[PDB]
Amino acid sequence: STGSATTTPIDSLDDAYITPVQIGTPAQTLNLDFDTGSSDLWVFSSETTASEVDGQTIYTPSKSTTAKLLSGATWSISYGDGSSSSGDVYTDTVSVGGLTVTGQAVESAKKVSSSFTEDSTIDGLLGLAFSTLNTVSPTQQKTFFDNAKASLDSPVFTADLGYHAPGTYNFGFIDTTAYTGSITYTAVSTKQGFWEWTSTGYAVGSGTFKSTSIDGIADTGTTLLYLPATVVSAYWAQVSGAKSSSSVGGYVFPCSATLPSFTFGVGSARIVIPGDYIDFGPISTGSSSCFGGIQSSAGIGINIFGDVALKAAFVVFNGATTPTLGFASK
Ligand SMILES: c1cnc2c(c1)ccc1cccnc12
């Protein structure tokens, strides 16, 4: 089998991407944030504290003839951005773009933190990291991809995120028309549960490529590109007026600037992020200071190849017996 679904930026900045997902019988369609940095499929629901729901679409398990409560199971997650959610668990039928998993764990939120409530466009998350990170207790649950993998034509999914435009998540096949050149594969460590790989270096604009190993994760659920302070300083030094702002919480730059591209290495291959992809707009409404799309990872403990980087590439999440990651230009 295969599945193919369109993913759409939630806003004019590409702060996140949503993909429609069918849950239950009859289908209830929720727009979920596919997150290769986590491993829980959780949804706003009829069980979510009413004051914490503000425009999201909810899953109502009582209206699904295939929903079964997973007895005694709870979940609770906290993300790198400080947000969190928690609740109980059902199994139900979940379909993404024609691909169906019966008995998928659907984690129904009883509580969500303020940033989730404040984002009316995201109805939940669909985790695509390794199932070892799944938070369901006392019986850990598998991700959608993990449940689907054996049935797929090939044990892979691909992320083709658009810049200010829709893109695609495919399960079970590589669309050879969706990229240019070849796909370069690179090794993955699963030891921390992430799609963790090592970039071979970087360049700023037309500058010299610096060969240097950068360990990080491929994370569709993080907006920006978080890299070591030395790398980020080298990038922003090329932008007149750019500075690191403690008040704002990262590098900012004059909105009148035209930004240089940023290249990252994948083995001997190179992915070029166009400068425009690094502009995240005014720091506050009407400001002429703009927030940068490349930020320091210094206070994180890990480098994160978020959407800023991944949207510049066609990315293969290869779930073969030894997982690997593939990148192509597009
Ligand atoms: C991800 C993270 N932080 C941001 C954005 C996206 C977009 C704009 C912005 C403006 C000020 C501070 N942070 C951000």
List the helices and strands and how they pair.
Elements (H helix, E strand, L loop, with lengths): L2 E7 L7 E7 L4 E8 L5 E3 L24 E11 L5 E13 L2 E14 L1 H4 L6 E4 L16 H5 L7 E5 L6 E5 L12 E4 L8 E9 L5 E9 L6 E3 L1 H8 L6 E3 L4 E5 L7 E5 L2 E5 L5 E4 L6 E4 L1 E3 L6 E3 L1 H4 L3 E5 L5 E5 L2
Parallel strand pairs: 3-8, 4-7, 13-22, 14-21
Antiparallel strand pairs: 1-2, 1-10, 2-3, 2-6, 4-8, 5-6, 6-7, 9-10, 9-23, 11-24, 12-13, 12-17, 14-22, 15-16, 16-20, 17-18, 19-20, 23-24
The chain binds 1,10-phenanthroline.
The site of 1,10-phenanthroline has 10 residues, from strand 19.
Q: Could you walk me through the main structural features you see in this protein, from its secondary elements to its overall organization?
A:
With 330 residues, the chain is mainly β. It folds into two domains: 5-174, no CATH class; 175-330, no CATH class. The protein has four helices and 24 strands. It has helices at 114-117, 144-148, 229-236, 307-310; strands at 3-9, 17-23, 28-35, 41-43, 68-78, 84-96, 99-112, 124-127, 156-160, 167-171, 184-187, 196-204, 210-218, 225-227, 243-245, 250-254, 262-266, 269-273, 279-282, 289-292, 294-296, 303-305, 314-318, 324-328. A seven-stranded mixed sheet has the order 18-17-12-13-22-14-21. A six-stranded mixed beta barrel has the order 2-3-8-4-7-6. It has a four-stranded antiparallel sheet with strand order 15-16-20-19, with no helix packed on it. Strand 2 and strand 3 form a beta hairpin. The chain binds 1,10-phenanthroline (PHN). Residues 13, 15, 223-224, 248-249, 280-281, 283, 291 line the site of 1,10-phenanthroline (PHN). 1,10-phenanthroline is lined by residues 13, 15, 223-224, 248-249, 280-281, 283, 291.
